[PDB]
Design a protein around this nucleic acid. Structure first.
Ligand code: ZN
Ligand code: ZN
Lengths: 197, 197
DNA sequence: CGGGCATGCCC
DNA sequence: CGGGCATGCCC
C-alpha cells in the first residue's frame, strides 16, 4: 500500500476548513498567509497560528493531526524531517520532528512504524462560546532551505481531523515556506504568479 | 596555556615554504590559488594539491601536520569541524574531521585530548630526485558556507613540519574558501581587494 | 560551460 | 526596519 499520504482536500460532513490571521506589511513579519497561493510564509521556530473552522460539531474524542509532505512529485516519497544541524542543536518533541505544537498539554508526536512519517496530534477542542474557530499554534523547526533537511523543497502541511476510531472526518492542506523574510518572500512569489504563472 | 595554535609563518632552518599549482580560467575550476590573497579557493571533497618546498633536508622521521583554524579574531577559539550534515552523510578519517589526505598509506588523524583540535599528519618524504618539491593531496569535506560548520567563516590551513621528537621545524599557512565556483570567487575577492582593500 | 537566481545574513 | 550582498544551485 502507498506510504505517500493523501493531500487531497476533503471538507467532509463537518465542513472542516482552515483559517489564517492577517499579518503586517513588514519584510520579516514572523508569519504571513497568501490566499492566492494557499501558502504560509513563516520564520523558523516561531508561532504559526492555524484556525480550524467547522460547520458541525465533531464527536467527543476527535483529534487534529499535522504532517508535512514534499509538494513536488519527485520528492513526495521522501519523509520530511528536521535537518541534522537543527536536530543536534535541539520538551516532548523528538529532535527529528519538523512540526511542533506549542501550548497544549495533550500533544502527541508520532513516528509511523510502517511509513516512517512524523506527525503531531492534539485533541480537537470546539471554539469557546463567543467564537467561530479553534486556533492551534504550530512551529516549524527548520527553514525550507535547510541543507540536509528540506533543502529548498516546498512542503505541504496536511491537517486532518480524525475521530477516536481513526475515521477521516476532514482534510485540508496549505503549502509552507519557512524563511528569514516572510513578507519579502510572499510578495516575491505573488508577483511571480502574476507575471509568469 | 593557550588552546589557539600559532598561525605565524616560521620558515625556520630548513627554509620551508608551500607551493601551489596554477589552474585554469573556469568559473568552477576545482581548485585555484591566489598569491595576492595567499588563499586557496577549492570545491568540497576534491583534490587540493599542496607543495612542500625546503632548502635543506629534514631529518628522518619528520612529519607534516595540517590543521584548520578560523581566521577572524572572534572565531579563533572555536574548533573547526565538519558540519552535522556532512558528518552524517560521511576509510580512516573520522567523520567530524574537515581536512583529509588522499593517497597516503601512512596518514594519522588526531583529536587533541586537551584543545579538542583536529589535525591530519603524514610522514615527510623528500622530493623524488628530478624534483624541487613534495606534493600532498588534501581534501576539505565541507564548503566554507556549511550551516552548523564553518558557516561562511574563513579558515586558515596551518601546515607544520615537525621532527619525530615534536620540535617545530617550519610553519606556513594559507587561507581557504571551499566553494561551488572557485574561479568566480577568487576573481571576486581579488577584484574587491583592488577596489576596496 | 558561464549568466544569473537564491535567501540567510550584513557586523 | 528595509536595501542589498551571498553563493549553492538552476531542472
Ligand atoms: Zn534545519
Ligand atoms: Zn558541510
Amino acid at each position: 500500500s502507498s506510504s505517500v499520504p493523501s493531500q487531497k482536500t476533503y471538507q467532509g460532513s463537518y465542513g472542516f476548513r482552515l483559517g489564517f490571521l492577517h499579518s503586517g506589511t513588514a519584510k520579516s513579519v514572523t508569519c504571513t498567509y497568501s490566499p492566492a497561493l494557499n501558502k504560509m510564509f513563516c520564520q523558523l521556530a516561531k508561532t504559526c497560528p492555524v484556525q480550524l473552522w467547522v460547520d458541525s460539531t465533531p464527536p467527543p474524542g476527535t483529534r487534529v493531526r499535522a504532517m508535512a509532505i514534499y509538494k513536488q512529485s519527485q520528492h513526495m516519497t521522501e519523509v520530511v524531517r528536521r535537518c541534522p544541524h537543527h536536530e543536534r542543536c535541539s520538551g516532548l518533541a523528538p529532535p527529528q520532528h519538523l512540526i511542533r505544537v506549542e501550548g497544549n498539554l495533550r500533544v502527541e508526536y508520532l513516528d509511523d512504524r510502517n511509513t516512517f512519517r512524523h506527525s503531531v496530534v492534539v485533541p480537537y477542542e470546539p471554539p469557546e462560546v463567543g467564537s467561530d474557530c479553534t486556533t492551534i499554534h504550530y512551529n516549524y523547526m527548520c527553514n525550507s532551505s535547510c541543507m540536509g533537511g528540506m533543502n529548498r523543497r516546498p512542503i505541504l502541511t496536511i491537517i486532518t481531523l480524525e475521530d477516536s476510531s481513526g475515521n477521516l472526518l476532514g482534510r485540508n492542506s496549505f503549502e509552507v515556506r519557512v524563511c528569514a523574510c516572510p513578507g519579502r518572500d510572499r510578495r516575491t512569489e505573488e508577483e511571480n504568479l502574476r507575471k509568469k504563472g
